[PDB]
Design a protein around this ligand. Structure first.
Ligand SMILES: [Cu+2]
Ligand SMILES: [Cu+2]
Lengths: 123, 123
């Protein structure tokens, strides 16, 4: 299955956001990151990645297609707006093995506040 | 401004969901509840409504246009699927005066679990 996530300056939940910021996928699913607004990109938050998945970083203003194979939580951020809280979370499969990494990963306060909000949708 | 919320059987966060389940609006905003899938409706959760706003209930499979004037939290549910957790939350303005009603409103466990997840996006 395919999932679409928009990169927006202003979404339904706030400013500088991935929308939806939380996506529940299954192994083999495709996640398309679409820059609805310019100035955004998507990059993996290395601390929040399943074992065995390579880090990724797209170019600004470009679409990025992420194929999730490994189960676990995938944390993503927008490089220039990490500080302003532009983060997203993808949960592949049940009982994420790296739930505690996601819960304790050190990050800019706004991003940490949004990651926590997203973690509350887990399972 | 206008905000669109879809009623779905299966969304990006789970099954039987309002999507987005959390909308941040300003007084005078319009919220359109669109049944993307059939069998859903939107009805106000009376315990989670600002002072002075009338309760509302739309017919199944119908669109509903909610104009939010009063600031505060507006809780909505899908009548036939309340028990399965199909609830949504709208925050109009800052510092919702009825935040504690939303936090303690008695409701079916799944709905309560989802409401709490949505409350975490508040402010
Ligand atoms: Cu960005
Ligand atoms: Cu429903």
């Amino acid at each position: 299955a395919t999932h679409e996530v928009h990169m927006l300056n202003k979404g339904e939940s706030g400013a500088m956001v991935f929308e939806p910021a939380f996506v529940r996928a299954e192994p083999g699913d495709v996640i398309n990151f679409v820059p609805t607004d310019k100035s955004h990109n998507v990059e993996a938050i290395k601390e929040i990645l399943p074992e065995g998945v390579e880090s990724f970083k797209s170019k600004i203003n470009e679409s990025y297609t992420l194929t999730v194979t490994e189960p676990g939580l995938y944390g993503v951020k927008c490089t220039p707006h990490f500080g302003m809280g532009m983060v997203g979370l993808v949960q592949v499969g049940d009982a994420p093995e790296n739930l505690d990494a996601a819960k304790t990963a050190k990050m800019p306060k706004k991003a940490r506040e949004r990651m926590d909000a997203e973690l509350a949708q887990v399972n």
